[PDB]
Nucleic acid binder design. Sequence first.
RNA 1: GUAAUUGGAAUGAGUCCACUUUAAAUCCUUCCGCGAGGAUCCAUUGGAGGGCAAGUCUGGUGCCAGCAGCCGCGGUAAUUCC
RNA 2: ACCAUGGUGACCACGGGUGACGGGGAAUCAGGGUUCGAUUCCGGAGAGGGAGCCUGAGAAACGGCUACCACAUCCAAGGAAG
Lengths: 131, 141, 57, 185
Amino acid sequence: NDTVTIRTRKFMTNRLLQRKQMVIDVLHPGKATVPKTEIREKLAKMYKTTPDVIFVFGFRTHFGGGKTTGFGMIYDSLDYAKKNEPKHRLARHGLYEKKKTSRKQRKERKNRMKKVRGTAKANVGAGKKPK
Amino acid sequence: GKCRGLRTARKLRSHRRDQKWHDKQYKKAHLGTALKANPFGGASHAKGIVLEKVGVEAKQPNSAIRKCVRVQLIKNGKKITAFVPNDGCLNFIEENDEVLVAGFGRKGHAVGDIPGVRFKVVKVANVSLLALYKGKKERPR
Amino acid sequence: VHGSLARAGKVRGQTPKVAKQEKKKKKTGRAKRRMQYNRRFVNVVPTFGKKKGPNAN
Amino acid sequence: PVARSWVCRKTYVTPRRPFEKSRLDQELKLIGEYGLRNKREVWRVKFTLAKIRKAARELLTLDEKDPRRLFEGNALLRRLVRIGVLDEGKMKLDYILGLKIEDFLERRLQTQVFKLGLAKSIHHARVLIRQRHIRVRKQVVNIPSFIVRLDSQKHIDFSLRSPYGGGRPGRVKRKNAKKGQGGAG
RNA sequence: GUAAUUGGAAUGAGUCCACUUUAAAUCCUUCCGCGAGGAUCCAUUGGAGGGCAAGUCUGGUGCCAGCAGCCGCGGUAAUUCC
RNA sequence: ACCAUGGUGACCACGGGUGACGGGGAAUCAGGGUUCGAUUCCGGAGAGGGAGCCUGAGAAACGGCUACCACAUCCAAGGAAG
């Protein structure tokens, strides 16, 4: 709100990706690191689009406040925002939930399905009732 | 003096690779029998148990009873002597400990006035011989 | 006599023990180099004498 | 097997012989009159001084009319002209050889915050840098060894977040005013 | 420079959000707050005869204990031993 | 397989050692060198020891098998797995 400047540079739009990708430098002079969810609407109210397809990350504040810099980007659709995007920044604000197993589980589950041959009723069912 | 000439480098090289066998601190680094000879065996430290406390005598201008032990190494097992180098520090090495014998100032030779010693004693029973003289540790149970 | 194995650990084993009394700490770090440049060079005193050194007694 | 850089060299140098009385004395008054912390960062800038002379005398053993020092010595000089140890219009590869380490301890950050009238008492001019009170034009830097350039030399200033250039007094003023109103309403 | 009296738009370690980084977190970077008077919130390692910068100051020992890389100091006043 | 009596050597063959993997390079430097390099890059080799193989385009592969020798595991001692 109060005393915050938003600037950006190296704007390259492209339609290989159908995004708009640029380097953003956020000026907070004596204040803390701004929330990213506040940044991803302060471009939407500049690019005349909704705060739904503007994604930012990667802010490392420079030494002693002032100009932090980072990345930000703008897609052309929310449906483009689910095609060409790695799933982790798709999930920092909820658009694709992620609760899977740890890899310690998933490996040893496959290590015990590996011994059992052919039984489609007992490849998956290789001890799902005991746990 | 020297044969010289542009084409005689075979003579000037098979004259140097055998006149190099006549200075010592090369010769105890490449001839091999002086590599097996030292008890540490190309190393810097060794552990070993204490077999006997002895008091050797000082050399010709001095007169003192220098204190030594009789470490026997567990690596390449063989008898050596070793020096316990401080004032109130005979008492901190006791019988059949495990001590870490180190070299003694001059590489391979005795210093000063101890005739017939080669190694010194640090780290009696996992604690440093400085760290028992200086009141920082004890001899653990 | 000449002390075969007895009186080993003798001269420290009978010394009079004097307590290390407390002092001010030394001005460590950068300020040591401040105060000892000040000890040596900012006051080049005209005391002569073939320049008796820095531990005069 | 790794994605690491590996590359490092030592920056200071240790002397040939120690314990000669005409070395530590003529080096002590560097450590005190220019206000440093230990003698390793005197040897640091002197070894920096040393190879430039070793560079320039690899260059002075060349003659006239060969292209390499034309690239090297000119690029040498357009880097230490801009640091301010050696002025511009008299650019030669020969004035550089008669140059002394008193000028490299003159172009620091730390002695220029003493002689631009920003402070007092050269050791104190160390203190203000490291205690986060001094900015370059937009950049606040707590480094005394910042050999600040000739170009950005008129631009050292107190920070906007400094006491001496801004506000919110820190913990000594806040503590004293609190207890006086901490006996009644 | 002691021995001081204070201080104040001085601050870092330390404890503390919160943002940030990151795949998820951690440092670190930023930033409420608390956080220095023997600023007890404390700097050691080795030496002080000569090579080699630095002591014939004090006490103890008495060729003993021990030091010392080399020369050497050690036998009742030690510039080297504790 | 039938013939011929040749080949190598003091310009160091052949045999022995190597606390020898080779090379890019590293430490050091007036010039000249002395030492190091198992080590992330490239090239060699081998998966306890030696041998033999199938499949595949490419393996004499060993996170493929079979045998022996050295080491070791389960067993209801009938046999299984390295």
